[PDB]
């Protein structure tokens, strides 16, 4: 086992949340009784000698194609999963100036239809996305335009 | 295999009911949709009783969200309860509302995203429309 990090980006230049779609066999196996699950950009701390926040940026870049500075990130929460791994969620505001193996497709979720999206159970999501989408709307969205 | 988690609010003590399993992790009441032909909310009621010692009816449960864990499907339920709904190796925990957000924020306390989500959701969706 290893620790991990997830990061929720908000792109103010589109009033959108940046998420990723990824294929999970478990969801496929489940729906064969698609396979494509919306998730927060994430990754494990494989590399010995890197800030959590640095792993966040690595994955912000590799998965989502966004440039990020560790200083730009703000810790949102930290928790345990599972055999168990510590995990840390980060949030940061980005703009289009920050915008540019596996099988990951980056996604943009317009704020307007975000909550509707989180609740529609026909679209596989992770708890992360749900909390991400939730925490945002309560803690950040009221302070924005 | 599917699964269910359930957040309870005890009006009588103004706490949230949680569960614990220095390796102490504070979790939401939960269990697997294990047996054939059991309604999700029934599985919730079962574990609410077996784990937490609370009597619940399926009609009390509100579906807060459904999502994927493990990468298991999972459906989270909420309901208000009172001491009247309460019986007399995990150990039940009651989190007073007044310090619930802070308890959640505190990184030096092993919680789950369930708990953190639950408190965050409860405090923004239920608490304000409450007394």
From Swiss-Prot, chain A:
Positions of short motif Nudix box: 48-66
GO cellular component: a single term: cytosol
BP GO terms, sorted: nucleoside phosphate metabolic process; protein N-linked glycosylation via asparagine; ribose phosphate metabolic process
Protein name: Uridine diphosphate glucose pyrophosphatase NUDT14
Enzyme superclass (EC): hydrolase
Main localisation: cytoplasm
Recorded effect of pH on activity: Optimum pH is 8.0-9.5.
Subunit text: Homodimer.
Catalyzed chemical reaction(s): UDP-sugar + H2O = UMP + alpha-D-aldose 1-phosphate
GO molecular function, one term: UDP-sugar diphosphatase activity
Cofactor: Mg(2+)
Sequence ranges assigned to domain Nudix hydrolase in this UniProt record: 1-131
Organism whose genome encodes this protein: Homo sapiens
Role noted for this protein: Hydrolyzes UDP-glucose to glucose 1-phosphate and UMP and ADP-ribose to ribose 5-phosphate and AMP. The physiological substrate is probably UDP-glucose. Poor activity on other substrates such as ADP-glucose, CDP-glucose, GDP-glucose and GDP-mannose.
Family the UniProt entry places it in: Belongs to the Nudix hydrolase family.
Location within or outside the cell: Cytoplasm
Keywords of the record: Cytoplasm, Hydrolase, Magnesium
EC number: 3.6.1.45
């Amino acid at each position: 086992t290893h620790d991990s990090v997830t990061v929720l980006l908000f792109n103010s230049s589109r009033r959108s949340l940046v998420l990723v779609k990824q294929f999970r066999p478990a969801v496929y196996a489940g729906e064969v009784e698609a396979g494509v699950t919306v998730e927060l950009c994430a990754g494990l701390v494989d590399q010995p000698g890197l800030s959590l926040e640095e792993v966040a940026c690595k994955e912000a870049w590799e998965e989502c194609g966004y440039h990020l500075a560790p200083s730009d990130l703000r810790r949102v929460a930290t928790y345990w999963s599972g055999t168990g791994s510590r995990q840390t969620m980060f949030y940061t505001e980005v703009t289009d100036a920050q915008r540019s193996g596996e099988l990951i497709e980056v996604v943009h979720l317009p704020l307007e239809g975000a909550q509707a999206f989180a609740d529609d159970p026909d679209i596989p999501k992770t708890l992360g996305v749900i909390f991400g989408v939730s925490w945002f709307l309560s803690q950040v969205a009221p302070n924005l335009d």
